[PDB]
Each structure stands twice: as C-alpha cells, then as structure tokens.
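Look over what follows to help learners.
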Amino acid sequence: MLKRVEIFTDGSCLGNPGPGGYGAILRYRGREKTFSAGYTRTTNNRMELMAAIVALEALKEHCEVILSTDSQYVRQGITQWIHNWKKRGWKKADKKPVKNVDLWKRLDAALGRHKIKWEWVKGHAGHPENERCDELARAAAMKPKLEDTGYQVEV
C-alpha cells in the first residue's frame, strides 16, 4: 500500500509584484510538517507555484499525493495550458516564451514522480489547512530571507 500524503499550498505577495512568500502543509498519518519561505521580490503566481514545488520535492519516495490549493493560476496551468505548452516545447502560439517556465518545468518534473490527485478549493471557509498556509506565506513575506533568482523584474 503506497504511502498516502496530503499537501496544502498557498503563496502570495505583499503587493504584486513585491516581497513574497509561500506556505505548505504536508500531512501524513496525523502528523504534519510545515514549509515556508519569503523572497525579496517576486510575484503571486511564482509563489503559488513554489509552494507546490517545495512540498512535492520534499517527498523522498513514490507516494499517492492529494494536492489541495485555491490557486487558479496553477489550476488552469495543470488543467489546460501545461499540456499545450509541452507540445510546443515551452513557447506560446505567438512565439512568446511561456511565463515562469523555470518553475513550471520544476513543478512538472516533481509531479511526474508521484500519483497526484488535485483538489481545487474556493475560499478559506471549510478549508483550515489552506487558511493556515496563507498565514505561513504572509509571515514569511514579512521578513524574506531568500531571493527569487528566476524572477526577471523587467524594465
């Protein structure tokens, strides 16, 4: 019987773009482990992705993951865009590069190593783990220690 793990993620910025942060809760057999980190300058989308990335990468063996988030950016990514992007070797129709391809590739990579089961949520109501993640992300964004080297900023 494959290890079953639940993952909750959320990421955001104190003004977008701006100081950002993410928070993830990885639960297993009633025991939970927290994950968080703050960056000097980044965007909401990157954080939403980072959260899922770090959590998934934390796993050290094949598992059955039940990933839950309220991020539409990640939702649409996984549900639609992600498939088409890979076909065109990571490049939109108008030849423009896909945004945050660095993090997307990383997420995809991590995803393929487990049996994911996505669960898209609406608000905080009836979703305590997620609310908690949001809390983690904000606190981390208050005093960021890391730096998002993959963030371009751009003129």
User: Anything to note?
Assistant: The first strand starts at residue 4 and ends at 13. Helices lie at 44-58, 72-87, 101-111, 128-142. DSSP finds four helices and six strands in the chain. The beta strands are 4-13, 18-28, 31-42, 64-69, 115-116, 119-120.
